[PDB]
Coordinates of C-alpha atoms and ligand atoms in Angstrom, one line a residue:
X1 CA 58.5 148.5 135.1
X2 CA 60.5 147.4 138.3
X3 CA 64.0 146.5 137.2
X4 CA 65.7 148.0 140.2
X5 CA 68.0 149.8 137.8
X6 CA 71.0 151.7 139.2
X7 CA 73.9 153.6 137.8
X8 CA 77.5 153.0 138.9
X9 CA 80.6 155.2 138.5
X10 CA 82.5 152.2 137.2
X11 CA 80.8 152.7 133.8
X12 CA 82.8 155.8 133.2
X13 CA 86.0 154.0 133.9
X14 CA 84.8 151.1 131.6
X15 CA 84.5 153.7 128.9
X16 CA 87.8 155.6 129.6
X17 CA 90.0 152.5 129.6
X18 CA 88.4 151.3 126.3
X19 CA 88.6 154.7 124.7
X20 CA 92.3 154.7 125.6
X21 CA 93.5 151.3 124.4
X22 CA 91.3 151.4 121.3
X23 CA 92.9 154.7 120.7
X24 CA 96.4 153.1 120.9
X25 CA 95.2 150.4 118.4
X26 CA 94.4 153.1 115.9
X27 CA 97.8 154.7 116.6
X28 CA 99.5 151.5 115.6
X29 CA 97.4 151.1 112.4
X30 CA 98.9 154.2 110.5
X31 CA 102.1 154.7 112.4
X32 CA 104.2 153.1 109.6
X33 CA 102.3 154.5 106.6
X34 CA 102.6 158.2 107.6
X35 CA 106.4 158.0 107.5
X36 CA 106.4 155.0 105.0
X37 CA 109.4 156.5 103.3
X38 CA 111.5 156.4 106.5
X39 CA 110.7 152.7 107.3
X40 CA 111.2 151.8 103.6
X41 CA 114.7 153.3 103.8
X42 CA 115.4 151.7 107.1
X43 CA 114.3 148.2 106.3
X44 CA 115.5 148.3 102.6
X45 CA 112.1 147.2 101.5
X46 CA 109.4 148.4 98.9
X47 CA 106.5 150.8 99.6
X48 CA 104.3 147.7 99.1
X49 CA 105.6 146.3 102.3
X50 CA 104.6 149.3 104.3
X51 CA 101.2 149.3 102.6
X52 CA 100.8 145.8 103.7
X53 CA 101.7 146.7 107.2
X54 CA 98.5 148.9 107.1
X55 CA 96.5 146.4 105.1
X56 CA 97.0 143.6 107.6
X57 CA 94.6 145.4 109.8
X58 CA 91.9 145.2 107.1
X59 CA 92.7 141.6 106.1
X60 CA 92.4 140.2 109.6
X61 CA 88.9 141.7 110.3
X62 CA 87.0 139.7 107.5
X63 CA 87.9 136.1 108.5
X64 CA 87.7 136.7 112.3
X65 CA 84.8 139.1 112.7
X66 CA 82.1 136.7 113.1
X67 CA 83.9 134.1 115.4
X68 CA 84.8 137.2 117.5
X69 CA 81.2 138.2 117.6
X70 CA 80.2 134.7 118.7
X71 CA 82.9 134.7 121.4
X72 CA 81.7 138.0 122.7
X73 CA 78.0 136.9 122.7
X74 CA 78.8 133.7 124.6
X75 CA 81.7 134.4 126.9
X76 CA 80.9 138.1 127.5
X77 CA 82.5 141.6 127.5
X78 CA 85.4 141.0 129.9
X79 CA 87.1 138.3 127.9
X80 CA 86.8 140.4 124.7
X81 CA 88.3 143.4 126.3
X82 CA 91.1 141.4 127.8
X83 CA 91.9 139.7 124.5
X84 CA 92.0 143.0 122.7
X85 CA 94.2 144.8 125.2
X86 CA 96.6 141.9 125.7
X87 CA 96.9 141.4 121.9
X88 CA 97.7 145.1 121.5
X89 CA 100.3 145.1 124.3
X90 CA 101.9 142.0 122.9
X91 CA 102.1 143.4 119.3
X92 CA 103.6 146.5 120.7
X93 CA 106.2 144.5 122.6
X94 CA 107.1 142.5 119.5
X95 CA 107.5 145.6 117.6
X96 CA 109.8 146.9 120.3
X97 CA 112.2 144.1 119.4
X98 CA 112.0 144.7 115.6
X99 CA 114.3 147.8 115.5
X100 CA 116.9 146.6 113.1
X101 CA 117.7 146.9 109.4
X102 CA 116.9 143.1 108.9
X103 CA 114.0 142.6 111.2
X104 CA 111.1 143.7 109.2
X105 CA 109.3 140.4 109.8
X106 CA 109.2 140.9 113.5
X107 CA 107.4 144.2 113.0
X108 CA 105.0 142.4 110.6
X109 CA 104.3 139.8 113.2
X110 CA 103.6 142.6 115.8
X111 CA 101.3 144.5 113.3
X112 CA 99.5 141.2 112.7
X113 CA 99.0 140.8 116.5
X114 CA 97.6 144.3 116.6
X115 CA 95.3 143.4 113.6
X116 CA 93.9 140.5 115.5
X117 CA 93.4 142.8 118.4
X118 CA 91.4 145.3 116.3
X119 CA 88.8 142.5 115.6
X120 CA 87.9 142.4 119.3
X121 CA 88.3 146.2 119.8
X122 CA 86.1 147.5 117.0
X123 CA 82.8 145.9 118.0
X124 CA 83.0 146.8 121.7
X125 CA 81.5 150.3 121.8
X126 CA 77.8 149.5 121.4
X127 CA 77.9 146.5 123.8
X128 CA 79.6 148.6 126.4
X129 CA 77.2 151.5 126.0
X130 CA 74.2 149.1 126.4
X131 CA 75.6 147.1 129.2
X132 CA 77.0 150.0 131.4
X133 CA 75.1 153.2 130.4
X134 CA 71.5 154.3 131.0
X135 CA 69.0 155.1 128.2
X136 CA 70.0 158.7 128.1
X137 CA 73.7 158.1 127.7
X138 CA 74.1 155.0 125.4
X139 CA 74.4 157.2 122.3
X140 CA 76.9 159.7 123.9
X141 CA 79.0 156.8 125.3
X142 CA 79.1 155.0 121.8
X143 CA 80.0 158.2 120.1
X144 CA 82.8 158.8 122.6
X145 CA 84.0 155.3 122.1
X146 CA 84.2 155.6 118.3
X147 CA 85.7 159.2 118.6
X148 CA 88.5 157.5 120.7
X149 CA 89.6 155.4 117.7
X150 CA 89.2 158.4 115.5
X151 CA 91.5 160.4 117.7
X152 CA 93.9 157.5 117.8
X153 CA 94.1 157.6 114.0
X154 CA 94.7 161.3 114.3
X155 CA 97.4 160.9 116.9
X156 CA 99.1 158.2 114.6
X157 CA 99.0 160.8 111.7
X158 CA 100.6 163.5 113.9
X159 CA 103.2 161.9 116.1
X160 CA 105.4 159.5 114.1
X161 CA 106.5 162.3 111.7
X162 CA 107.8 164.4 114.6
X163 CA 109.2 161.4 116.8
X164 CA 111.2 160.0 113.9
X165 CA 113.1 162.6 111.7
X166 CA 114.1 161.3 108.3
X167 CA 117.8 160.8 109.1
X168 CA 118.6 158.2 106.5
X169 CA 122.3 158.9 106.5
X170 CA 122.7 158.1 110.2
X171 CA 121.2 154.6 110.9
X172 CA 121.8 154.6 114.6
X173 CA 119.9 157.8 115.3
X174 CA 117.0 156.5 113.2
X175 CA 117.0 153.2 115.1
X176 CA 117.1 155.1 118.5
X177 CA 114.1 157.1 117.4
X178 CA 112.1 154.1 116.3
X179 CA 113.0 152.4 119.6
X180 CA 111.8 155.3 121.6
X181 CA 108.4 155.4 119.7
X182 CA 107.9 151.7 120.0
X183 CA 108.9 151.6 123.6
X184 CA 106.5 154.5 124.4
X185 CA 103.6 152.7 122.6
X186 CA 104.4 149.4 124.5
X187 CA 104.5 151.1 127.8
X188 CA 101.1 152.7 127.2
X189 CA 99.6 149.6 126.0
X190 CA 100.9 147.6 128.9
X191 CA 99.5 150.2 131.4
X192 CA 96.1 150.0 129.6
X193 CA 96.1 146.2 129.7
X194 CA 96.8 146.3 133.5
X195 CA 94.0 148.8 133.9
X196 CA 91.7 146.7 131.9
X197 CA 92.5 143.6 133.9
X198 CA 92.1 145.5 137.3
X199 CA 89.0 147.5 136.6
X200 CA 87.2 146.2 133.5
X201 CA 84.4 144.3 135.1
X202 CA 82.0 142.1 133.2
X203 CA 78.8 144.0 134.0
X204 CA 77.5 146.3 136.7
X205 CA 75.9 144.8 139.6
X206 CA 72.4 146.3 138.6
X207 CA 71.1 146.8 135.2
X208 CA 71.6 150.5 134.0
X209 CA 68.3 150.4 131.9
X210 CA 65.0 148.7 131.8
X211 CA 65.9 147.2 128.4
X212 CA 69.2 146.1 129.7
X213 CA 67.5 144.7 132.7
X214 CA 65.3 142.6 130.4
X215 CA 68.1 141.5 128.3
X216 CA 70.2 140.3 131.4
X217 CA 67.1 138.7 133.1
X218 CA 66.3 136.5 130.0
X219 CA 69.1 134.8 128.2
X220 CA 68.9 135.2 124.4
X221 CA 67.7 132.1 122.4
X222 CA 70.1 130.3 120.1
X223 CA 70.7 132.2 116.9
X224 CA 72.5 131.5 113.7
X225 CA 74.8 134.1 112.1
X226 CA 74.7 132.4 108.7
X227 CA 70.9 132.6 108.6
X228 CA 71.0 136.3 109.5
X229 CA 73.7 137.0 106.9
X230 CA 71.6 135.3 104.2
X231 CA 68.5 137.2 105.2
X232 CA 70.4 140.4 105.0
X233 CA 71.9 139.8 101.6
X234 CA 68.5 139.1 100.1
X235 CA 67.6 142.8 100.9
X236 CA 68.7 144.6 97.8
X237 CA 68.8 148.1 99.6
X238 CA 71.0 146.8 102.2
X239 CA 73.4 145.3 99.7
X240 CA 73.6 148.7 97.9
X241 CA 74.2 150.5 101.1
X242 CA 76.9 147.8 102.0
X243 CA 78.6 148.5 98.7
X244 CA 78.5 152.3 99.1
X245 CA 79.7 152.3 102.7
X246 CA 82.5 149.9 101.8
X247 CA 83.6 152.0 98.8
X248 CA 83.7 155.2 101.0
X249 CA 85.5 153.6 104.0
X250 CA 88.0 151.9 101.6
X251 CA 88.7 155.1 99.9
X252 CA 89.3 156.7 103.2
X253 CA 91.7 153.8 104.2
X254 CA 93.6 154.1 100.9
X255 CA 94.0 157.9 101.2
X256 CA 95.3 157.4 104.8
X257 CA 97.7 154.6 103.8
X258 CA 99.2 156.5 100.7
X259 CA 99.0 160.0 101.9
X260 CA 102.8 160.1 102.7
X261 CA 103.7 159.1 99.2
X262 CA 101.3 161.5 97.5
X263 CA 102.6 164.4 99.5
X264 CA 106.3 163.4 99.1
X265 CA 105.8 163.1 95.4
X266 CA 105.3 166.9 95.1
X267 CA 106.7 168.2 98.3
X268 CA 110.2 167.2 99.5
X269 CA 111.0 166.9 103.3
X270 CA 107.5 167.6 104.4
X271 CA 106.7 164.5 106.4
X272 CA 105.6 166.7 109.4
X273 CA 103.3 168.7 107.2
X274 CA 101.9 165.3 105.8
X275 CA 101.0 164.3 109.3
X276 CA 99.4 167.6 110.0
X277 CA 97.3 167.3 106.8
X278 CA 96.2 163.8 108.0
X279 CA 95.4 165.0 111.4
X280 CA 93.4 167.9 109.9
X281 CA 91.5 165.4 107.7
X282 CA 90.7 163.2 110.7
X283 CA 89.6 166.2 112.9
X284 CA 87.5 167.6 110.1
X285 CA 85.9 164.3 109.8
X286 CA 85.1 164.0 113.3
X287 CA 83.5 167.5 113.3
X288 CA 81.4 166.4 110.3
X289 CA 80.4 163.3 111.8
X290 CA 79.1 165.2 114.9
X291 CA 77.2 167.8 112.8
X292 CA 75.7 165.0 110.6
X293 CA 74.5 163.2 113.6
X294 CA 72.9 166.4 115.0
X295 CA 71.4 167.1 111.6
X296 CA 70.0 163.5 111.4
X297 CA 68.4 164.1 114.9
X298 CA 67.0 167.3 113.8
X299 CA 65.5 165.7 110.5
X300 CA 64.9 161.9 110.4
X301 CA 65.6 161.9 106.6
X302 CA 68.3 159.4 105.7
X303 CA 68.3 158.9 101.9
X304 CA 68.6 162.6 101.0
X305 CA 71.2 163.4 103.6
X306 CA 73.2 160.4 102.6
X307 CA 73.1 161.1 99.0
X308 CA 74.1 164.8 99.5
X309 CA 77.0 163.8 101.8
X310 CA 78.2 161.3 99.1
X311 CA 78.1 163.9 96.4
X312 CA 80.0 166.5 98.5
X313 CA 82.5 163.8 99.4
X314 CA 83.0 163.2 95.6
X315 CA 83.3 167.0 94.9
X316 CA 85.9 167.2 97.7
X317 CA 87.8 164.2 96.4
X318 CA 87.9 165.8 93.0
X319 CA 89.1 169.1 94.3
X320 CA 91.8 167.4 96.2
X321 CA 92.9 165.4 93.2
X322 CA 93.1 168.5 90.9
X323 CA 94.8 170.7 93.7
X324 CA 97.3 168.4 95.0
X325 CA 100.0 169.2 92.4
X326 CA 99.8 173.0 92.9
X327 CA 102.9 173.1 95.0
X328 CA 101.2 174.9 97.9
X329 CA 100.7 173.2 101.2
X330 CA 97.8 175.3 102.4
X331 CA 95.6 174.3 99.7
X332 CA 96.4 170.7 100.4
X333 CA 95.4 171.4 104.1
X334 CA 92.0 173.0 103.0
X335 CA 91.2 170.2 100.6
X336 CA 92.2 167.5 103.1
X337 CA 90.0 169.1 105.7
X338 CA 86.9 169.3 103.4
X339 CA 87.4 165.7 102.2
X340 CA 87.8 164.3 105.6
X341 CA 84.9 166.3 106.9
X342 CA 82.5 164.8 104.3
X343 CA 84.0 161.2 104.1
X344 CA 83.7 160.7 107.9
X345 CA 80.4 162.5 108.2
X346 CA 79.1 159.9 105.7
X347 CA 80.0 156.9 107.9
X348 CA 77.6 157.2 110.9
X349 CA 74.8 158.2 108.6
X350 CA 75.2 155.1 106.4
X351 CA 75.5 153.0 109.6
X352 CA 72.2 154.4 110.9
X353 CA 70.7 153.9 107.4
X354 CA 71.8 150.3 107.6
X355 CA 70.3 149.6 111.0
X356 CA 66.9 151.2 109.8
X357 CA 66.8 149.0 106.7
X358 CA 67.7 145.9 108.8
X359 CA 65.7 146.6 111.9
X360 CA 64.4 143.0 112.3
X361 CA 67.9 141.5 112.0
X362 CA 70.5 141.8 114.7
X363 CA 72.7 145.0 114.7
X364 CA 75.9 143.0 115.2
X365 CA 75.6 141.0 112.1
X366 CA 75.0 144.2 110.0
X367 CA 77.8 145.9 111.8
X368 CA 80.2 143.1 110.9
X369 CA 79.1 143.0 107.3
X370 CA 79.6 146.7 106.9
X371 CA 83.1 146.6 108.5
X372 CA 84.1 143.6 106.4
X373 CA 82.9 145.4 103.2
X374 CA 84.9 148.4 104.4
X375 CA 88.1 146.3 104.8
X376 CA 87.7 144.5 101.4
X377 CA 87.2 147.9 99.6
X378 CA 90.1 149.3 101.5
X379 CA 92.5 146.6 100.6
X380 CA 91.4 146.7 96.9
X381 CA 91.7 150.5 96.7
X382 CA 95.0 150.6 98.5
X383 CA 96.5 148.0 96.2
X384 CA 95.2 149.7 93.1
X385 CA 95.9 153.3 94.1
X386 CA 99.5 152.3 95.2
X387 CA 100.2 150.6 92.0
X388 CA 98.8 153.6 90.0
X389 CA 100.8 156.2 92.0
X390 CA 104.0 154.2 91.6
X391 CA 103.5 153.9 87.9
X392 CA 101.6 156.9 86.6
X393 CA 101.7 159.2 89.6
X394 CA 99.2 160.2 92.4
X395 CA 96.7 161.7 89.9
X396 CA 95.9 158.4 88.3
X397 CA 95.0 156.8 91.7
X398 CA 93.1 159.9 92.8
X399 CA 91.0 159.7 89.6
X400 CA 90.5 156.0 90.3
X401 CA 89.1 156.9 93.7
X402 CA 87.0 159.7 92.2
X403 CA 85.5 157.2 89.6
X404 CA 84.7 154.8 92.5
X405 CA 83.0 157.6 94.5
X406 CA 80.9 158.4 91.5
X407 CA 79.9 154.7 91.2
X408 CA 79.0 154.9 94.9
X409 CA 76.8 158.0 94.2
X410 CA 75.0 156.2 91.5
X411 CA 74.5 153.2 93.7
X412 CA 73.3 155.3 96.6
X413 CA 70.7 157.0 94.3
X414 CA 69.4 153.6 93.3
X415 CA 68.6 152.6 96.8
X416 CA 64.9 152.4 97.6
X417 CA 63.7 153.1 101.1
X418 CA 60.7 154.7 102.8
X419 CA 62.8 155.7 105.9
Ligands
Y01_1 C1 97.4 136.7 110.7 C2 96.7 137.6 109.7 C3 96.7 139.0 110.1 C4 97.2 137.4 108.3 C5 98.6 137.7 108.1 C6 99.1 137.7 106.6 C7 100.5 138.3 106.3 C8 101.5 137.4 107.1 C9 100.7 138.3 104.8 C10 99.4 138.7 103.9 C11 99.9 139.5 102.7 C12 101.3 139.3 102.8 C13 102.1 140.3 101.9 C14 101.7 140.1 100.4 C15 102.6 140.6 99.4 C16 103.9 141.0 99.8 C17 104.8 141.6 98.7 C18 106.1 141.0 98.7 O1 107.0 141.6 97.8 C19 107.9 140.9 97.1 O2 108.1 139.7 97.2 C20 108.7 141.8 96.0 C21 109.6 142.8 96.7 C22 110.4 143.5 95.6 O3 109.8 144.3 94.8 O4 111.7 143.3 95.7 C23 106.8 141.0 100.0 C24 105.9 140.3 100.9 C25 104.5 140.9 101.2 C26 104.6 142.3 101.8 C27 103.6 139.9 102.0 C28 104.1 139.9 103.4 C29 103.2 139.0 104.3 C30 101.8 139.4 104.3 C31 101.4 140.8 104.8
Y01_2 C1 79.9 143.4 99.7 C2 81.3 143.0 99.6 C3 82.3 144.1 99.3 C4 81.7 142.2 100.9 C5 81.0 140.8 101.0 C6 81.5 140.0 102.2 C7 80.8 138.8 102.6 C8 80.3 138.0 101.4 C9 81.6 137.9 103.5 C10 82.6 138.6 104.5 C11 82.9 137.8 105.7 C12 82.3 136.4 105.3 C13 82.0 135.5 106.5 C14 83.2 135.0 107.1 C15 83.0 133.8 108.0 C16 81.9 133.1 108.0 C17 81.8 131.9 109.0 C18 81.4 130.6 108.5 O1 81.0 129.7 109.5 C19 80.5 128.5 109.1 O2 80.8 127.8 108.3 C20 79.4 128.1 110.2 C21 78.4 129.1 110.4 C22 77.2 128.9 111.5 O3 77.7 128.7 112.7 O4 76.1 128.8 111.1 C23 80.2 130.8 107.5 C24 80.4 131.9 106.4 C25 80.8 133.3 107.1 C26 79.6 133.9 107.8 C27 81.1 134.2 105.9 C28 80.0 134.6 104.9 C29 80.4 135.6 103.9 C30 81.0 137.0 104.5 C31 79.9 137.6 105.3
Y01_3 C1 84.7 150.3 88.6 C2 86.2 150.2 88.3 C3 86.5 148.8 87.7 C4 86.7 151.3 87.5 C5 88.1 151.2 87.1 C6 88.6 152.4 86.1 C7 90.0 152.3 85.7 C8 90.2 151.4 84.6 C9 90.5 153.9 85.4 C10 90.0 154.8 86.6 C11 91.2 155.9 86.6 C12 92.1 155.7 85.4 C13 93.4 156.3 85.4 C14 93.2 157.8 85.5 C15 94.5 158.5 85.0 C16 95.5 158.0 84.3 C17 96.8 158.7 84.0 C18 97.1 158.6 82.5 O1 98.4 159.2 82.2 C19 98.9 159.2 80.9 O2 99.9 158.7 80.7 C20 98.0 159.8 80.0 C21 97.5 161.3 80.5 C22 98.7 162.2 80.6 O3 99.4 162.5 79.8 O4 98.9 162.6 81.9 C23 97.3 157.1 82.2 C24 96.0 156.4 82.4 C25 95.5 156.5 83.9 C26 96.5 155.7 84.8 C27 94.1 155.9 84.0 C28 94.0 154.4 83.8 C29 92.7 153.7 83.9 C30 92.0 154.1 85.3 C31 92.8 153.4 86.5

C-alpha cells in the first residue's frame, strides 16, 4: 500500500461551497409553497400553480437523473458543480425579473432552471466525499453535505414568511418584498457560483485514500446503466425498499408543499407560525437522522430498525392528522416535530439498507432509482392531497397519507433480508 496519499485543505472549501449552494437550491424549492397563499393572491392564480412550482423540482429529476450521472462519470466533478451552481444562479436571476402581477410564467421558468440544477446538485455529496476526503472523514463529509440541503429546506420554511408579509391590499409593498427576497437569493447564488468557479477544483493533487488512489489510477471499464437498472429491478427486496422509500419521501414532500394550506385552513394569519412549524419539522428530522445513524452504527440491524421507524412515522402522522384541527398551535408544533423526526430518520436508514441489498451493483444507479421513486411518489401524493384538501379539507389528505404509510409498513414487513 504505497499510494502517496495526502490531505489538502482545499477539500474543506470544496465541501463548504457545495453545502452552501446546495442549501440555496433547497431554499428555492419551498420558498413559494410556504407562503403559497401570498403568491396565489399576487399572481391571481390557483393553489395548484404554486404546488406545481414545488413539483417541477420532482418532475425534472426523473428524466434527467441518469444522463446527469453519465455526464458526472465521464466529464468529472467540476463540470457538474459548475452546471448546478450556474443553473441555480440563472434561475434566481430569472425569478428576480418575475415580480409582477402578470409574470407568473417567468417565475415558473426560473423554478424550472433551479429544478434542472437540483439534478446535478443532489448526487454530488458522495462523489465529493470520496474524491476529496480520507477514509475517516468520508461519512462525516457526506452527512454534512446532505445536512446542508436539509438546512436549506429549513431556511426556506422559515424566511419567506417573515420576508414577505401578507399585505394583499397593498400590491406595491408586496412586490417590493418579493423583489427583495429574490434579489437576496440571486446575490447569494451569484457569489456561490463565483466561488465554485474560482476554487472548486476537479480533484486534489494526490489521492486522499488508498481506495481513491486505486480508483484514480485505473479508469473504470465501460458500464451500462440500463443493465444495472434491470438487474436491480429483478431483486424483489430492493423493489420493496424502493416503494417504501418513495412513499415516505413523497409523503414528506407533500406535507412540505401543502403545509401552508393546511395551517391556514384552521389558523388565520399564521404564516410565520407555519414557517416555524416547518423548520421545527426539518430540524427534528435532522436530529432523528443523526440519532438513527448512530443507532445503526451501534447495532448493524437494518430490517428491525427500519420497520420500527416506519411504524413510529405512521403513528406520528396519525397523531398530527387528528390533532391539526384542535385550534392550538403548540400541539401542531409538537406533532410536526415528532413526525419530521421519524420521517427524516427513516431516509438514511432506508438508503443504507438499499446499498446493503444491492452491494454488487453500483451505488449511483440505486441512488438515482431511490430518488426517482421519491420524486414520483411526491408528485402523486402532492396532487392527491391537494385535491382532497381543496375538496374535503386537510383531514382527507392526511388520512390518505396515513393509509399510504400503513401500506408502506406492510411492504417493509414483507421484505426478506439477512442483513
Ligand atoms: C423543464 C422541466 C422542469 C419540465 C417543466 C414542465 C412545466 C413547464 C409544466 C409541467 C406541468 C405543468 C403544469 C400542469 C398543470 C397546470 C394547471 C393549469 O391550471 C389550469 O389551466 C386551470 C386554472 C384555473 O383553475 O383557472 C395551469 C398550468 C399548470 C400549473 C402547468 C404549468 C406548466 C407545468 C409546470
Ligand atoms: C418504483 C416506482 C415508484 C419508480 C420506478 C421508476 C423507474 C421505472 C424509472 C425512473 C427513471 C427511468 C429511467 C429514465 C431514463 C432512462 C434512460 C434510457 O436510456 C436509453 O434509452 C439508453 C440507455 C443506455 O445507455 O444503455 C433508458 C431507460 C432509463 C434508464 C429509464 C428506465 C426506467 C426508470 C429507471
Ligand atoms: C393505495 C391507495 C390507492 C389508497 C387510496 C385510498 C383512498 C381511496 C382513500 C384514502 C383516504 C380517503 C379519504 C379520507 C377522508 C375523507 C373525508 C370524508 O368526508 C366526508 O364527507 C365524510 C365524513 C365526514 O362527514 O367528515 C369523505 C371521504 C374522504 C375524502 C376519503 C375518500 C377516500 C380516500 C381518499
